[PDB]
Amino acid sequence: QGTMRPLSVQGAWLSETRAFADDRGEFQELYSARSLRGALGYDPGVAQVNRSVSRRGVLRGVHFAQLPPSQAKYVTCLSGAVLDVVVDIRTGSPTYRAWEAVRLDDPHRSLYVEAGLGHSFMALTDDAVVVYLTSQGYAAGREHGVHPLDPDLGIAWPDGIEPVLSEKDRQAPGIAEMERRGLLPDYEECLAFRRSLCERGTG
Amino acid sequence: QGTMRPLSVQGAWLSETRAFADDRGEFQELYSARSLRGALGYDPGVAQVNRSVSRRGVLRGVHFAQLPPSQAKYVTCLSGAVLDVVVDIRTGSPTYRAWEAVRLDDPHRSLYVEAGLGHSFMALTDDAVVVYLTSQGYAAGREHGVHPLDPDLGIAWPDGIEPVLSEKDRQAPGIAEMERRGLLPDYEECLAFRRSLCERGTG
Numbered sequence: 537q538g539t540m541r542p543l544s545v546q547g548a549w550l551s552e553t554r555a556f557a558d559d560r561g562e563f564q565e566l567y568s569a570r571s572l573r574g575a576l577g578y579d580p581g582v583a584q585v586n587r588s589v590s591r592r593g594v595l596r597g598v599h600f601a602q603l604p605p606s607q608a609k610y611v612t613c614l615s616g617a618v619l620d621v622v623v624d625i626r627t628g629s630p631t632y633r634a635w636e637a638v639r640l641d642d643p644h645r646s647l648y649v650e651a652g653l654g655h656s657f658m659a660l661t662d663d664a665v666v667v668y669l670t671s672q673g674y675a676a677g678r679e680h681g682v683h684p685l686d687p688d689l690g691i692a693w694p695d696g697i698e699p700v701l702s703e704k705d706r707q708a709p710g711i712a713e714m715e716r717r718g719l720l721p722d723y724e725e726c727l728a729f730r731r732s733l734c735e736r737g738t739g
Numbered sequence: 740q741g742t743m744r745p746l747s748v749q750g751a752w753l754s755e756t757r758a759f760a761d762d763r764g765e766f767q768e769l770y771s772a773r774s775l776r777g778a779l780g781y782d783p784g785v786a787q788v789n790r791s792v793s794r795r796g797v798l799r800g801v802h803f804a805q806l807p808p809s810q811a812k813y814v815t816c817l818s819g820a821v822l823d824v825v826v827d828i829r830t831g832s833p834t835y836r837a838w839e840a841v842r843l844d845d846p847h848r849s850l851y852v853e854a855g856l857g858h859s860f861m862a863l864t865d866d867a868v869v870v871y872l873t874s875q876g877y878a879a880g881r882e883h884g885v886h887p888l889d890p891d892l893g894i895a896w897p898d899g900i901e902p903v904l905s906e907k908d909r910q911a912p913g914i915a916e917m918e919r920r921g922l923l924p925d926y927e928e929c930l931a932f933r934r935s936l937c938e939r940g941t942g
């Protein structure tokens with residue numbers, strides 16, 4: 537049926553889901569916990585499903601919950617198109633500060649971002665709708681951000697679209713400032729958290 | 740924030756979810772497990788997220804998974820409009836064969852249908868998109884159906900829209916035939932299953 541395959545940043549995955557089309561329309565399995573368990577070694581669970589509507593050029597991120605337990609995300613653009621960027625915010629990672637852009641322009645493609653990574657996207661179309669599943673409920677005191685236009689990340693956001701940032705995102709610190717202030721996830725700690733999820737039922 | 744309140748059929752609920760609107764668009768908490776736990780006494784979990792696109796007049800249902808563990812559903816029309824009908828297929832229920840129609844015409848309204856109830860909807864607009872969370876993964880051998888146009892249910896589907904049924908739904912038996920063949924959930928068994936979910940962690 538559908539595939540799930542690792543991206544260039546360890547802990548980020550691309551899901552391609554299958555639809556069964558017929559005269560009535562279509563039926564799609566957008567998310568399968570069984571499927572994630574086979575690929576990841578654990579079922580991340582779904583504490584919250586969030587939906588955002590974004591005007592064109594709106595850039596949300598780079599956001600992450602404090603580890604642990606942080607928040608894993610399964611992200612899908614249900615209509616319109618976004619450019620999703622995953623950011624390796626994890627100090628000590630062999631790919632720390634690296635990023636990868638995935639075009640999410642079809643409901644049949646989903647991005648999984650494990651706990652401890654940074655997530656962001658820009659709306660490529662007016663009223664782009666994004667729906668994401670999170671492993672952990674929202675907690676304002678636990679949510680953090682790095683500035684998406686930080687030259688230290690140097691994310692290639694689309695030429696020809698002016699970013700529209702929230703007040704919060706506009707004021708966000710750069711990666712270096714988050715790092716020195718010890719506010720970024722530690723890579724070793726991320727990997728240990730990953731192993732811990734596999735071990736809830738390794739007995 | 741958002742409300743969750745019982746409908747007229749015990750085990751069906753209406754969720755009204757809140758969005759935070761701003762210049763960038765909006766952010767909605769479409770589903771909260773914490774919220775369901777407060778109302779229901781248990782977190783149903785999310786094994787699968789399904790998405791269907793339906794042409795106008797398409798009627799999917801009345802469907803249910805064999806109890807147990809059957810399948811609880813959290814259903815939302817993300818765009819366009821459907822008329823959702825919940826059916827009490829549970830023999831011995833004080834409201835057996837009763838139904839209730841909910842207009843799902845806004846992404847901020849969701850319907851929860853606990854394990855053991857029947858679910859169906861008709862597309863009121865062309866390409867109505869429905870997204871639903873299920874507590875249990877899909878299993879073809881476990882999925883059953885009652886004919887949605889059964890006069891023994893007498894569901895008031897919208898006047899002026901011709902139903903479009905799949906081959907499977909077109910051929911589905913009536914409620915009476917499912918009943919005598921012992922293929923419907925038992926009400927007592929439904930209630931016991933409900934109590935069992937509360938008790939996974941009543942220790």
Ligand SMILES: Cc1cn([C@H]2C[C@H](O)[C@@H](COP(=O)(O)OP(=O)(O)O)O2)c(=O)[nH]c1=O
Pocket residue numbers: 586588596597599673674675702704759766768
């Ligand atoms: C992330 C999140 C935000 N919110 C609220 C807080 C704000 O009032 C509004 C937007 O928050 P914000 O953090 O700016 O969201 P985004 O990730 O889309 O940039 O939504 C929730 O209610 N729940 C959540 O899980």
Ligand SMILES: Cc1cn([C@H]2C[C@H](O)[C@@H](COP(=O)(O)OP(=O)(O)O)O2)c(=O)[nH]c1=O
Pocket residue numbers: 556563565789791799800802876877878905907
């Ligand atoms: C309910 C369901 C159906 N399917 C498949 C079986 C069929 O080929 C197709 C449509 O099934 P069908 O049972 O007719 O779906 P609906 O509830 O929308 O009437 O989708 C899945 O792959 N997973 C599921 O969870």
Ligand SMILES: [Cl-]
Pocket residue numbers: 580581582608609610669670671
């Ligand atoms: Cl998830």
Ligand SMILES: [Cl-]
Pocket residue numbers: 783784785811812813872873874
């Ligand atoms: Cl559910």
